[PDB]
Amino acid sequence: THIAMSGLTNMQKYWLITGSVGPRPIALVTSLNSEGLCNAAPYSAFNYMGEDPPLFVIAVDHKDTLKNIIEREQFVVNMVDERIAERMVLCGSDFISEAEAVGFDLTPSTTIDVPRITDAPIAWECKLYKIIDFSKQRSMVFGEIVAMYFREELIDEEKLRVRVDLFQPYGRLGGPNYCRTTDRVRLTVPTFLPSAG
Amino acid sequence: THIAMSGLTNMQKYWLITGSVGPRPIALVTSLNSEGLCNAAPYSAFNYMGEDPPLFVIAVDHKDTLKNIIEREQFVVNMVDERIAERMVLCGSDFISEAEAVGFDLTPSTTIDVPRITDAPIAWECKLYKIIDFSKQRSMVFGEIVAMYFREELIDEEKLRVRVDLFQPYGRLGGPNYCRTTDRVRLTVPTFLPSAG
DSSP secondary structure letters along A112-179: SSSPEETT-SEEEEEEEEEEEEEETTEEEEEEEEEEEEE-GGGEETTTTEE-TTT--PEEE-SSSEEE
Q: Do B155 and A79 touch (CB under 8 A)?
A: no
- Please tell me what resolution, in angstroms, this structure has: 1.7
Question: E strand or H helix at B29, and its extent?
Answer: strand B27-32
Please enumerate in sequence order all residues whose Cβ is within 8 A of that of A165, keeping only pairs 6 or more positions apart, or say none.
Answer: none
Distance from CA of A82 to the nearest CA of B (A): 11
Query: Are the CB atoms for A56 and B46 separated by under 8 Å?
Result: no
DSSP per position, B110-179: SSSSSPEETT-SEEEEEEEEEEEEEETTEEEEEEEEEEEEE-GGGEETTTTEE-TTT--PEEE-SSSEEE
* Number of Cβ within a 10 Å radius of residue B42: 24
CA distance B1 to A147: 11
Residues A132-145: b if buried by 16+ CB within 10 A, e if exposed:
eebeeebbbbbbbb
Looking at the partner chain, which of B93, B148, B177 has a beta carbon nearest the beta carbon of A3?
Answer: B148
Q: What's the alpha-carbon Rg for chain B, to the nearest Å?
A: 18
Please enumerate in sequence order all residues whose Cβ is within 8 A of that of A143, keeping only pairs 6 or more positions apart, or say none.
Answer: A55, A56, A57, A58, A75, A77, A124, A126, A127, A128, A129
Amino acid identity of B46? F
Residue count of chain A, please give it.
Answer: 197
Q: What is the DSSP letter of A192?
A: S
Cis amide leading into B53 (omega within 30): yes
Cα–Cα nearest to B78, from B63, B62, B65: B65
Q: Do B24 and A25 touch (CB under 8 A)?
A: yes
Query: Are the CB atoms for A38 and B47 separated by under 8 Å?
Result: no
* Number of Cβ within a 10 Å radius of residue A147: 20
Method of determination used here: X-ray
N- to C-terminal Cα distance for chain B? 29
- Contacting residues of B for A131, CB less than 8 Å apart: none
Residues B43-68: b if buried by 16+ CB within 10 A, e if exposed:
bbbbbbbbbeebbbbbbbeebbbbeb
- Contacting residues of A for B110, CB less than 8 Å apart: 2, 4
CA distance B99 to A159: 36
CA distance B43 to B88: 10
Angle CA B62–B64–B65, to nearest 5: 85
Distance from CA of A136 to the nearest CA of B (A): 11
Cα–Cα nearest to A142, from A52, A79, A14, A54: A54
Q: Do B17 and A49 touch (CB under 8 A)?
A: no
**So what's the architecture of A1-197 in CATH?**
Roll (2.30)
